[PDB]
From a paper:
The adenosine-to-inosine (A-to-I) editing in anticodons of tRNAs is critical for wobble base-pairing during translation. This modification is produced via deamination on A34 and catalyzed by the adenosine deaminase acting on tRNA (ADAT) enzyme. By contrast, in eukaryotic organisms like yeasts, ADAT is a heterodimer formed by ADAT2 and ADAT3 (the ScADAT2/3 heterodimer). ADAT2 is the catalytic subunit, and ADAT3 serves only a structural role, because the essential glutamate in the conserved H(C) XE motif of the latter is usually mutated to a catalytically inactive residue (a valine in the ScADAT3 case).
In this study, we determined a crystal structure of the ScADAT2/3 heterodimer to 2.8 Å and revealed the assembly of the eukaryotic ADAT enzymes. There are two ScADAT2 (chains A and B) and two ScADAT3 copies (chains C and D) in the asymmetric unit, forming two heterodimers. The ScADAT2 and ScADAT3 subunits of the heterodimer make substantial contacts, exclusively through the ScADAT2-CD/ScADAT3-PCD interface, burying a total surface area of 2010 Å2. Like SaTadA, the active site of ScADAT2 comprised a zinc ion coordinated by four ligands: His54, Cys88, Cys91, and a water molecule. Importantly, while the C-terminal half of ScADAT3 forms a pseudo-catalytic domain (PCD), resembling TadA, the eukaryote-specific N-terminal sequence forms a stand-alone domain and functions as a tRNA-binding domain. Full-length ScADAT2/3 showed a strong binding capacity to the tRNAAla substrate, but the tRNA binding affinity for the ScADAT3/ΔAsp30-Pro148 mutant (the ScADAT3 N-lobe deletion mutant with the removal of residues Asp30-Pro148 from ScADAT2/3, designated as Del30-148) was completely lost, underscoring the importance of RLD to tRNA binding. We also discovered the zinc-binding site in ScADAT3, which is coordinated by four ligands: His216, Cys254, Cys257, and Cys322. Cys322, the last residue in the ScADAT3 coding sequence, forms the fourth ligand using its side chain and replaces the catalytic water molecule as found in ScADAT2. Surprisingly, we found that the tRNA entrance into PCD is blocked by ScADAT3 itself. Specifically, the last fragment of ScADAT3 (Trp306-Cys322) forms a loop and winds back into the pseudo-active site.
Residue numbers in the entry:
A (entry chain A): -1 to 165, 178 to 244
B (entry chain C): 8 to 74, 84 to 88, 95 to 105, 122 to 322
Write the structure that this text describes.
Amino acid sequence: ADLQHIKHMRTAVRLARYALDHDETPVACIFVHTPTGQVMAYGMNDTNKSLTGVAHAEFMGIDQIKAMLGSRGVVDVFKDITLYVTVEPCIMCASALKQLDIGKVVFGCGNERFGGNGTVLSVNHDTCTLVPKNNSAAGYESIPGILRKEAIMLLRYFYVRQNERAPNTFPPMEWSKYLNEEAFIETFGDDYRTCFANKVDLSSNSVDWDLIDSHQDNIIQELEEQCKMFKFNV
Amino acid sequence: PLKIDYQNGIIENRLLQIRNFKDVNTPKLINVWSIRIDPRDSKKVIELIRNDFQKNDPVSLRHLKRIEVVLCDEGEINNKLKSPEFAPSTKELNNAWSVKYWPLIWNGNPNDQILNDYKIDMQEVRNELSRASTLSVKMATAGKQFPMVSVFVDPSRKKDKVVAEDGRNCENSLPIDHSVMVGIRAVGERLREGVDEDANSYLCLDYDVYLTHEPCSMCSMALIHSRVRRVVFLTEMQRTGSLKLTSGDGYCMNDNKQLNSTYEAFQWIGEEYPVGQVDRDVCC
Ligand SMILES: [Zn+2]
Ligand SMILES: [Zn+2]
């Protein structure tokens, strides 16, 4: 419930919306350099172009950083990065992010079938997925539920849209999969704290319709300018 | 055809079946989409719900003693105008689940039917494994610090097998450039080029994959997304492996009911095909 988190997730949601409108799954990434508050890379699902089942948002953003900074660059900077994703990283992405030693993940809605930050596995706090520098597994935090409703709604749009081819009620939020009540209240306010962790319900009260219903065709050009600014600040 | 040791899940003294036992104890339920009738209707409905409801349902409900009957709204009542997602492993578990949720048909350990249905070409397996291993030792002999190999065979066996060395040996590499990932990207780029791929090529669907080393959590899940049929590996990685029950945190990613998808997995437990020593902390 930090406001930088709202800000950056809003960006992620705009990008996911763009993904929806280009016939792709609305999972989208914003890699933020936490010490400066700067947007350093972005991602969208890209399995339509790649024809592989591995070209996920996070992967796209890892490539962008590798291109901007080189391999050494990626490995060096990554511990300083806060990732913002609309949907919880899948096990595969959660594991890649673990191995690269990411600072932190903030996500919207859980990933019901493949979620590797608590929903199906907790790769981010496991013991078999290591940081190679020192073969460690201290882990990373993954903050759930930031614009959860928005992420869920974008997915519903996708499911409906997907069917167009040639021939509110949001689920209970099992928060205890992603943090302990103490870790909840350190993460969120004490008012929202008690009530929300307790009743298995979402932090918010109305769906931001303008954000998810309006198109974002300029989003790429916006993120490009912002990314190149970060590059000139390096 | 094949010698099966049903006791231990070892095929031909060499292929050790890899799957999960902890999770086979608990039941993963569904709701009862029931139907109530009297016996005369029963025989007519069981015909209708037999041919379509078994032939068409994406779930496999053949372990359910369907007699107080459930086919599996529009297509359902149109045809009806005429008038444990998974089996348990023990008889005890069968009887208890029978009364807890629904009568089930007990037909022995369902893993016995799985081992029997495994269609395996023993010589192909040996071949690919010999190939990956010989490369592995070459790589090690060459000083390469990540002497791991993945070999991707397509369903038809007519395309060129894709041979993928670990990327962390290469110049501009990331810690996540593991051999399974590389081979997956290679198959993808082969589809993208389109010279040797039909319009019914999709992902690595029904590919078999041969690894010198048990894959990490990223790679395991990566093969789930790529919809491969089978993985066969040589070296277990207790610290990092994500297939064997006793490797890693027991992810058993090939055989996790919570995902919608599985693949068959085997370890080779003979000594014929030695590989390059890898540090045990290495993911992959
Ligand atoms: Zn993913
Ligand atoms: Zn791996």
